[PDB]
Subunit: 532 residues, 3 copies
């Protein structure tokens, strides 16, 4: 087999052919194709620039580096979320603005297959594109799968709240990667006219943000947010960000005389220096002691007036923006195992009481943002069922799982619906065999669990039962169908009701059946409590 | 009511209201409006670039930092020159290209008031805009007052004598602020068609230079120089500047292989390194020992072929330019106390003698630039009056003051008059009650004295006598009048004759009246003596 | 009598006049005219850029700095090759993109004399333009002599094989200077339509490369390669260069994560650091210990896709480029002393034997590149002669000279001839009197020996005899006749046949006369042996 060579604006790319069990046409794969100029030196904390064109044939045949992040934390999430047999270790580097392509098309002739661009999660602090192999998806549903990478942590979200460092560089990288798709994907058998953006968690939030940004208008045609939206305050830094900026500057050892001075100084530091600072800050771990409101937050999406002209809560109440089919969905136990574990959540006992509950939730303020004078009312409505200390822990996890993902998600879907745009919702409730051993077997539909079915882990890994194997096939159909027509339906698949007034949504799992009114009670209770 | 918000070209700015005794309408003050991109990193030693526009409302409510300078000397000059009750301490920074705006207009309606841009002095080595509060002048004369800052010392005047580092960055910053005003001052109630530039000392020197530069052509319509002009040699380096550049490069710890190499190296130093380098050169103090003519330079205005195409001495006796009304003035005793006190001039005796005189006057070369063979003739002229060891000390001061301000000022005036453009002269002779304690009472019209009257110190500070209050109301009317018509005269004021052929000028003080032939005698004497 | 002053595109240059022995027309000399912007900071490893225009008159009267290189080796080569009486001490700097002009034309009147641009040699690692004084040649043949410089070693040839650092900066520097000649030379009395480029060794290789470069088409009209062509392997690294980059990267102490990462780290290193890295490398010295092949050669000309689109080998077989009169030549004893000396070749005992030869040959791999399995046949061909162990050393020095210069050189001329363009060859067989003392009198026509005749050492240095003087004059006529008409012939000169199918070449020395089939037998052997 002679390597697939594609011609792109910036030059030619050389890839490799990989065949998948049960498919005639081997999939053409490309790794580490640059879509932007390396954000080094003076390019740090600025919008991504076009990639410099190359003279000969570029070998897109080596997994690219994952943006600088906590290597330990990074590699772990890669392992837990990956869908490939063996996990692929990755190197760090500021030089990370790359994207991988998986095309099943026969490059020998013209092809305009729907394109699906994936934005990985990791709370904007960690993650990589290489973690997800788009082999199965491409072959199984005949779509072009593109996994993109974007600036994380300080490198992609540091903001002085002014024109010296607006922020949201990570998000600008996403929009930059999307343009590349529009100008080149046709060379890989893709249809720049049928691009669908889908991500999980932080990636879900990103898709949520892009669906709102005037900078993305016309860059995609359908969107999927998996367990993550923009109303999810945790990732969106509203209010004056200046204070957090100065805090970072000082930790890195810089004067805070003026914004421009901070930025200039941070541009002076080395990758290693910013990483150490990144770690002293302990952004991914939750601070137990101290004041709930003080415990340093983090850094993420901001309202720069470029990507976002205003907070998401506001924007969504404005039906004058360009709309597109939008699928929003959550898992059964978003806060089941994964997240708590990675945050080192205080759940050693496996039990709880009305007191600790009101105490853990308060300290969990940097996550669920709940006023202390509200703590009780909330703690009661949930943990008031039985007296079982164990039944309590579980309801508490639901409590949180509804605040971060449940309520926000349904709300977003509602508004999008009311906006007059095609909307679909779903609740994934399954337990993949590819779960971690340290995961209690009772936890079903945990954070990220649907990833294995969406990316077809069953056709790359081992031990998947016929049930699981078919659950995956089923899901890819849905996703691919949506990608094709902005409607998940297709012959041979359960019927997926459109999310309208009836609020019909689809429950996916062992038995995939349609239902209605998702987290309706939940949305109600919280819409009020928060209104104080 | 509500804080003032003006929309400029680069975005909206938020100011603050301040009422002043006897004025209904409060003055809208704006602090720290950026008129240039912070000259940091590679931008060091290069022309000023346009400021980047901002997405929301910018708060122009804090005093901006002052450009890097001797923190010690800076605070001292500010306290001595400030027209306000309590001196405002400042921060040092390379990010200092800001300006403050004081408009007395009712921003709720259209207004086109005359505009006066103030350029602070400080030997191009120290100074700040914030030192001068425009609240009084704006309220009392109904004009917009704009105080600007420009790079100082190494940062704004370093020159290799060639294209790798022309120099005059500071003057360019000044020209830059005039362009900002031309494009934005209307949003603050100003009339871009009537901008008057004025400054004292180094600032007066700056105004003079701008009057001779093609770069400032059409950016101002009137000009006033308070005790300082172009011929004021000391601030205008002549000959090869390369040697001084190298002296500076070595002190900072750089190579000196080529001009490009020097500049490339200093560009890499840090603010503190250049600040500590500045402190070592001791530009401010006068060296008492070693050979006089050698004594260390100071950097300043240079003939770069961009701002000045030749020496002021050459440009005046020449080109058919675009002239404008020009007001040039000096004080009664320019070297009476303030300057000598700050240069630590050796006069602890309170007396001098014909011999010591010639000794001092020769060591004072870096200030007067008089050949040693001329000294006796010159020394004799002034000190040859009587034998009093006191009357000598004083006459020696008139000597210095005449060579540095008196004669140069009148020559300039004449040259301007002869060019055929309105010309006015004045001589301020009054001892403000806001003078420093350590200042003998025998001094009148010391350096900087007319500053309290010009910016109405009597209306901010305390204790002004009715006579001092009046002197201020008067001077301001004159300035403002000149700024409106280009003629100081107006009702309720003594007649100020034009500096035409009769060489009439205004003697300002407790008793203001017109006179003729200011310094005529000296100009003559020094023209021959200097002609070897 | 008054300093010459010519106006160039970026400003005025002030030179000096100099008179040679009996010439009435003095020669104007300009030293250090910049033809590009100092390649500092980010400009490192990037194509040369235009120079910044200066404002007044620039004094071109000081030897510019030679580009960073080994100061020991650099001084040494300059001392061995200089044709001036006293050697000129030089300074090192990244700031070195300058050229020197020697024009015999009367600047007061129009003048379009032929232009001869000289590219110095030095293995692309060392060398400087100032070594070569153009006074004699300029006066003696009435042509304008131009000596140019270009980045060396790491600064001028570091390549990552991709767009982040293509390479050949040094060759691009040469092309830039040529463009500078085209736009200015006329101002110096030179005809931009008749520019001849000639260089020695590495400078010879450069001339050969410009001859095949699409970029350089139209920048010259005649070319002379003296002991060095593009086929001279040792200077053109084919294959993947990425490794040598990683090696340099690591030695300089830089991560090797990605090309962009490497390039970015090296740009951050100080000139001094990169020189230390250059010394650690140990390029100019042949390594005896270790694997012959692994013993890294150097780093030089690469196929970037901008200056060269394919290996010289492939390019020559293409008669579809621009063709011009090309003179190519070698010296009787190319490897007779200078080269084996500067590299510390193990030949002290002044003799060799078949075994030590085959073994020596294998170690010299990074010089003549000879598959180990070939050595015996090769060594048996040259050393199969007498049993005289001393003759074997000389014949071994022929073996090498042939593979590095003789053979490659003839093949080029032939290929050029066959492409349909005027070709001329020669063999210099003479021992200049200006040879180092440590050079055996039996070595005649050693590497670089012709330089003394070409640049007329006999008319600047002492000791030359009537015969050497006569030789120099002769050679200078030939070189200038070529520069004039693309034909070395002229009245009063031996006939120099054209290198057509008969393959006539000129033998230069004490007895200069025509001849045929130079190296004919040797090329057949090596072409055949190398066919593997
Ligand atoms: C010790 C010094 C400081 C403060 C003084 C205050 C009042 C009397 C006298 O005035 C002295 C001077 C000495 C005489 C000279 C110093 C010159 O710097 C300015 C002047 O006019 O007087
Ligand atoms: C002892 C060795 C080192 C330095 C010398 C210096 C001057 C005389 C002679 O030159 C010797 C040589 C012996 C002859 C060798 C020198 C090689 O450099 C090439 C050669 O032709 O034979
Ligand atoms: C820097 C490096 O050595 N890695 C590889 C890079 C990748 O493009 C990037 O790392 C992104 O994967 O360049 C190649 O792919 C190429 O163009 O031939 C080969 C090389 O092995
Ligand atoms: C550090 C500081 O005090 N400067 C402040 C500036 C100044 O007013 C000038 O714009 C620039 O110095 O503006 C702010 O106050 C503002 O617009 O919110 C932010 C900043 O903190
Ligand atoms: C660039 C530089 O500063 N170097 C020297 C220059 C040369 O033009 C260049 O070095 C190239 O020769 O010449 C000078 O004397 C000059 O008057 O311009 C200044 C200095 O001595
Ligand atoms: C790129 O891949 C091809 C095919 O596998 C290979 O022949 C070539 O050597 C590679 N080039 C690089 C840049 O290593
Ligand atoms: C500017 O001042 C206003 C007061 O009117 C304040 O509300 C605002 O926070 C200040 N700017 C910022 C964003 O800090
Ligand atoms: C340039 O040359 C002129 C006269 O040739 C000389 O006066 C001047 O000083 C030189 N430039 C320098 C080095 O200052």
């Amino acid at each position: 087999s002679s390597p697939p060579v594609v011609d792109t604006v910036h030059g030619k790319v050389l890839g490799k052919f990989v065949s998948l069990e049960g498919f005639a046409q081997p999939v053409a794969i490309f790794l580490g194709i640059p879509f932007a100029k390396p954000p080094l030196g003076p390019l740090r904390f600025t919008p991504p620039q076009p990639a410099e064109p190359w003279s000969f044939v570029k070998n897109a045949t080596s997994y690219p580096p994952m943006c600088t992040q906590d290597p330990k934390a990074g590699q772990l999430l890669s392992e837990l979320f990956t869908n490939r047999k063996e996990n692929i270790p990755l190197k760090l580097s500021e030089d990370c603005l790359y994207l991988n392509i998986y095309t099943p098309a026969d490059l020998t002739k013209k092809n305009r297959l729907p394109v699906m661009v994936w934005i990985h999660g990791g709370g904007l602090m960690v993650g990589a594109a290489s973690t997800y192999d788009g082999l199965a998806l491409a072959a199984h549903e005949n779509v072009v799968v593109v996994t993109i990478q974007y600036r994380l942590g300080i490198w992609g979200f540091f903001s002085t709240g002014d024109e010296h460092s607006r922020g949201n560089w990570g998000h600008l990288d996403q929009v930059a990667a999307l343009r590349w798709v529009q100008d080149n994907i046709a060379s890989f058998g893709g249809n720049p006219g049928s691009v669908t953006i889908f991500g999980e968690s932080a990636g879900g939030e990103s898709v949520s943000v892009l669906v709102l940004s005037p900078l993305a208008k016309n860059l995609f045609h359908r969107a999927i947010s998996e367990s993550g939206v923009a109303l999810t305050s945790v990732l969106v830094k509203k209010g004056d960000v200046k204070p957090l900026a100065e805090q970072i500057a000082i930790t890195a050892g810089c004067k805070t005389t003026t914004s421009a001075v901070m930025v200039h100084c941070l541009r002076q530091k080395t990758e290693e220096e910013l990483l150490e600072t990144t770690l002293k800050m302990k952004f991914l771990s939750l601070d137990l002691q101290g004041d709930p409101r003080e415990s340093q937050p983090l850094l993420g999406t901001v309202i720069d007036g470029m990507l976002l002209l205003k907070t998401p809560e506001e924007l969504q109440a404005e039906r004058n923006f360009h709309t597109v089919p939008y699928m929003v969905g959550i898992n059964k136990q978003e806060f089941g195992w994964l997240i708590p574990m990675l945050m080192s959540y205080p759940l050693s006992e496996g039990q709880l009481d009305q007191k600790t509950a009101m105490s853990l939730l308060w300290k969990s303020y940097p996550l669920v943002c709940i006023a202390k004078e509200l703590i009780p009312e909330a703690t009661e409505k949930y943990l008031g069922g039985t007296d079982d200390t164990v039944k309590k822990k579980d309801l508490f996890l639901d409590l949180i799982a509804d605040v971060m993902f449940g309520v926000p998600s349904v709300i977003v879907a509602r508004n999008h619906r009311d906006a007059g745009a095609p909307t679909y919702m779903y609740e994934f409730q399954y337990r993949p065999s590819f779960s971690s051993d340290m995961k209690p077997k009772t936890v079903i539909g945990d954070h990220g669990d649907e990833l294995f079915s969406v990316f077809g882990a069953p056709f790359l890994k081992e031990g998947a039962s016929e049930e699981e194997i078919r659950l995956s096939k089923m899901v890819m159909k849905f996703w691919a169908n949506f990608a094709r027509n902005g409607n998940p339906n297709g012959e041979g698949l359960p019927h997926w009701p459109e999310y309208n007034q009836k609020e019909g949504y689809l429950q996916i799992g062992a038995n995939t059946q349609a239902a209605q009114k998702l987290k309706d009670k939940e949305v109600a209770f919280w819409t009020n409590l928060f209104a104080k």
